[PDB]
Design a protein around this ligand. Structure first.
Ligand SMILES: C/C=C(\C)CC/C=C(\C)CCC=C(C)C
Lengths: 371, 173, 145
């Protein structure tokens, strides 16, 4: 009841908004601890018919279930308790002072390699927990990802999640279009494909990699179905000048999640085993054959020499290179993107007609207007 | 008309400017003698006259920016102003003269013209805006990218500094 | 595709870079190394150098970061120059043959104490053509390998 809601919490200010759900900050009176409450209008202002009123409850009743199946894990919010009324459904969870990753990705257009590594290190380690418990999300968008004051990822809105029965593969289309895996559309356009399994989350996570490190979705174009053929066919490019400055270890791991065929996809457990997420543990013996020692000393030299060489190569900003090609070189390109999102950062929102790629023009107008 | 043409006719008609842009014009004008739009100057004497956070200064920058009637061209001027701001930080020296914020768009229109001609644009797609003088595709072009509007305006905000500043030094990348 | 081996080779290289077991390589630490190998760059140079690799990192390179560099991002020309450079770094003599003692010279420089025969062995293990010398061709063949 609503009395049970106000006997423990008091909502102070409005944090965010949604289609029918409102996120509101509250104070827990017994503990005086900051907590977020999401306030879903079940009746939805009267627009919801009794079916949607019932369906939203069943979706919400299910929604408590998954958030009740996963708990105590560092990188998904804890549904502290849930209150249901005839007209609302209150869900109290942790307070994330900073907003979604979309808002952050708007502030910093291109998210740096070190920062994304721990971001997704959590997300992949999030993905492992879901797959080990056999629960797929189907909704892994950055707006579904919440960040706290220490930048820690808090995956949010398992609203589209559903627990696969052991060895069962879904058919319903759930998810905003860009972040849908190729067989999501294929199952939508054919009945022979008997469904998709838990490998769906791998593609959605690999999409964040292209968005975070480049500021654009891997496949984006303004009409709806055209994006889909880029997805199922799987035509993606680490285009220039943007994607050449990043290290090569980035590219391969991006392709692994982005393979169109599900069985060859890079599952979460081995996903964390790719060279990017390797960590330097100080206490390792690391024994090596005499050839192995010789490489290390050679590689230690090869490294030092390399670092001097790479740096010597960086071209200081001069008048001419600005005139010929600003985007080509990193410091000016990241700047143009940065002041691109300060002027029109309000023009990026959730959906298809408001994605971040609308703020980037990487192709000639003629090729864009070819068809 | 177009996607960003509808996002620039809705961004320069409301006089929507990024947070602190009026606080960024103050920094630029101290490195210059003024900022001229359609031959209406906003001199550096304003920088001492009102504080950067003074709303009266915001009126002075705003009043100069409505000297262009067409809304979409105003936003082109707006982000053109900022490509001087971001280039001002890189450049150690000061231009020491007037800068026509309008013109930087015009050769940027002209330089946007040349690259698309070379890459295969027809005369039909690159059609002129009747009043402004900017290509309609340039209005529809995205802000960032290889061929974005603020890549061409980060391009034309350097040829104008070529004539006014014979020698320039760019540091801190 | 970098093997468990390769990743491990990068890791021991990161170890050779940091004397302290910090878990990070400082502008000063890199420096101690470059000077160890005879390239003494401005403390400022170092700052820039560690910056080019990291960009945040406050002047410290990390290993996940380290591998990012040691993965062959290098262009054939770019690597070629580098491969060549190390080889020179290897031969103070510049004679062009890798002395067993020259290998020792480098280690001694990097502060790792390893057995004399082992060193000969290190070359011998990798040495066919240059009996007692690793030719540059051997070096390049080896690096790719
Ligand atoms: C490093 C910049 C290189 C081409 C662009 C030229 C910069 C300027 C021409 C002057 C504009 C602003 C000044 C604030 C002081």
């Amino acid at each position: 009841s609503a009395q049970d809601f106000y006997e423990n919490y008091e909502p102070k200010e409005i944090l965010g908004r949604g289609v029918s759900s409102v996120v509101r900050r509250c104070i827990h009176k017994p503990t005086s601890q900051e907590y977020a409450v999401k306030v879903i209008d079940v009746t939805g202002g009267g627009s919801f018919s009794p079916e949607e009123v019932r369906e939203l409850r069943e979706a919400t009743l299910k929604e408590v279930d998954i958030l009740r199946k996963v708990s105590g894990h560092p990188n998904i919010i804890q549904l502290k308790d849930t209150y249901e009324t005839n007209t609302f459904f209150f869900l109290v969870f942790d307070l994330m002072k900073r907003g979604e990753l979309f808002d952050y990705l708007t502030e910093k257009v291109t998210l740096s390699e070190k920062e994304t590594r721990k971001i997704m290190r959590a997300l992949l380690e999030v993905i492992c927990t879901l797959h080990k418990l056999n629960i797929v999300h189907r909704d892994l968008k950055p707006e579904n990802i919440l960040l706290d004051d220490n930048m820690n990822i808090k995956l949010t809105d398992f609203g589209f999640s559903c627990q696969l029965e052991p060895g069962e593969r879904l058919r319903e289309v759930c998810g905003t279009p860009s972040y849908l895996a190729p067989e999501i559309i294929e199952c939508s356009m054919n009945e022979d494909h008997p469904g998709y399994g838990k490998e769906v989350d791998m593609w959605s996570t690999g999409v964040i990699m292209y968005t975070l490190l480049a500021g654009s979705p891997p496949f984006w174009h303004r009409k709806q179905m055209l994006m889909l053929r880029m997805i199922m066919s799987g035509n993606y490019q680490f285009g220039s000048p943007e994607w050449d400055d990043y290290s090569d270890t980035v590219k391969d791991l991006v392709s692994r999640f982005l393979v169109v065929q599900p069985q060859n996809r890079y599952t979460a457990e081995e996903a964390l085993a790719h060279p990017f997420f390797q960590q330097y543990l100080v206490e390792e013996v690391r024994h090596f054959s005499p050839r192995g020692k010789f490489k290390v000393i050679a590689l230690t030299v090869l490294a030092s020499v390399r670092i001097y060489y790479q740096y010597r190569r960086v071209k200081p900003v001069t008048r001419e290179i600005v005139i010929r090609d600003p985007y080509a070189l990193r410091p000016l390109r990241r700047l143009i993107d940065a002041y691109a999102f300060r002027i029109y950062g309000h023009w990026v929102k959730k959906g298809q007609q408001q994605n971040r790629a609308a703020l980037f023009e990487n192709t000639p107008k003629a090729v864009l207007l070819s068809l | 008309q177009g996607q960003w043409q509808r996002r620039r006719r809705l961004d320069g008609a409301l006089n929507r400017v990024p947070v602190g842009f009026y606080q960024k014009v103050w920094k630029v004008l101290q490195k210059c003698h003024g900022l001229s739009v359609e031959g209406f100057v906003l001199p550096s004497s304003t920088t001492r006259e009102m504080t950067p956070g003074e709303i009266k200064f915001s009126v002075h920058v705003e009043s100069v920016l409505n000297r262009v009637p067409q809304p979409e061209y105003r936003q082109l001027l707006v982000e053109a102003i900022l490509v001087l701001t971001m280039l001002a930080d890189i450049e150690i020296h000061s231009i020491g003269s007037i800068i026509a914020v309008e013109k930087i768009v015009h050769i940027a229109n002209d330089l946007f013209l040349q690259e698309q001609k070379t890459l295969g644009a027809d005369d039909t797609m690159l059609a002129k805006d009747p009043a402004s003088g900017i290509c309609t595709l340039l209005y529809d072009s995205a802000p960032s990218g290889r061929f974005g509007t603020m890549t061409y305006l980060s391009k034309a905000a350097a040829t104008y500094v070529q004539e006014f500043l014979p020698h320039s030094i760019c540091a801190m990348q | 595709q970098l093997t468990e081996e390769q990743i491990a080779e990068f890791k021991e290289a990161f170890s050779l870079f940091d004397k302290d077991g910090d878990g990070t390589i400082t502008t000063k630490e890199l420096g101690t190394v470059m000077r160890s190998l005879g390239q003494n760059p401005t403390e400022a140079e170092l700052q820039d150098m560690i910056n080019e690799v990291d960009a945040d990192g406050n002047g410290t390179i990390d290993f996940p970061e380290f591998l990012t560099m040691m993965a062959r991002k290098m262009k054939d020309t770019d690597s070629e120059e580098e491969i060549r450079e190390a080889f020179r770094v290897f031969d103070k003599d510049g004679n062009g043959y890798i002395s067993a003692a020259e290998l020792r010279h480098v280690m001694t420089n990097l502060g790792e104490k390893l057995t004399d025969e082992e060193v000969d062995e290190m070359i011998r293990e990798a040495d066919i053509d240059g009996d007692g010398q690793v030719n540059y061709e051997e070096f390049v063949q080896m690096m790719t390998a």
